[PDB]
UniProtKB/Swiss-Prot annotation:
InterPro entries: Glyco_hydro_22, Glyco_hydro_22_CS, Glyco_hydro_22_lys, Lysozyme-like_dom_sf
Record: active site: 35, 52
GO molecular function: beta-N-acetylglucosaminidase activity; identical protein binding; lysozyme activity
Catalytic activity, as annotated: Hydrolysis of (1->4)-beta-linkages between N-acetylmuramic acid and N-acetyl-D-glucosamine residues in a peptidoglycan and between N-acetyl-D-glucosamine residues in chitodextrins
Further information: Lysozyme C is capable of both hydrolysis and transglycosylation; it also shows a slight esterase activity. It acts rapidly on both peptide-substituted and unsubstituted peptidoglycan, and slowly on chitin oligosaccharides.
Record keyword ATP-binding present: no
Disulfide bridge map: 6-127, 30-115, 64-80, 76-94
Organism: Gallus gallus (Chicken)
Primary gene name: LYZ
A GO term from the CC aspect: extracellular space
Protein name, UniProt field: Lysozyme C
Length: 129
């Protein structure tokens, strides 16, 4: 599924991301835009042979099992393919574990480089929430 901006903001709010570990909703919408272009089916392979999955580009080295990343962890206890679903539940639940890990949203490269320090409220402007 390719979400619209305000449709994803509403889905993220329903799933408890607004202000989760102090990150306002616009931070999560910005991260999703730049990680996946709001596409739940996005995948990208990394140099190390791990792969990033779904709307928040969660990595198989640590967070999910894809059967092809040797010596990796599965800290979210899920197949990586669950992160591709039109239902964002699994991605959100995993994202909550990641953001609690000690580096906050800095775990997401695109957030650090493209959202951090910007007017992230723009991402939710106009939306009925
Ligand atoms: Cl915000
Ligand atoms: Cl893994
Ligand atoms: Cl933090």
């Amino acid at each position: 599924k390719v979400f619209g901006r305000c449709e994803l903001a509403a889905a993220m709010k329903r799933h408890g991301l607004d202000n989760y570990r102090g990150y306002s909703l616009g931070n999560w919408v910005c991260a999703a835009k730049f990680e996946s272009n709001f596409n739940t089916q996005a995948t990208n392979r990394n140099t190390d042979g791990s792969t990033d999955y779904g709307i928040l580009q969660i990595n198989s080295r640590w967070w999910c099992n894809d059967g092809r990343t040797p010596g990796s962890r599965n800290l979210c206890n899920i197949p990586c393919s669950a992160l591709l679903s039109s239902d964002i539940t699994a991605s959100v639940n995993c994202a909550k574990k990641i953001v609690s890990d000690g580096n906050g949203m800095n775990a997401w490269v695109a957030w650090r480089n493209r959202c951090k320090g910007t007017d992230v409220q723009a991402w939710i402007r106009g939306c009925r929430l």
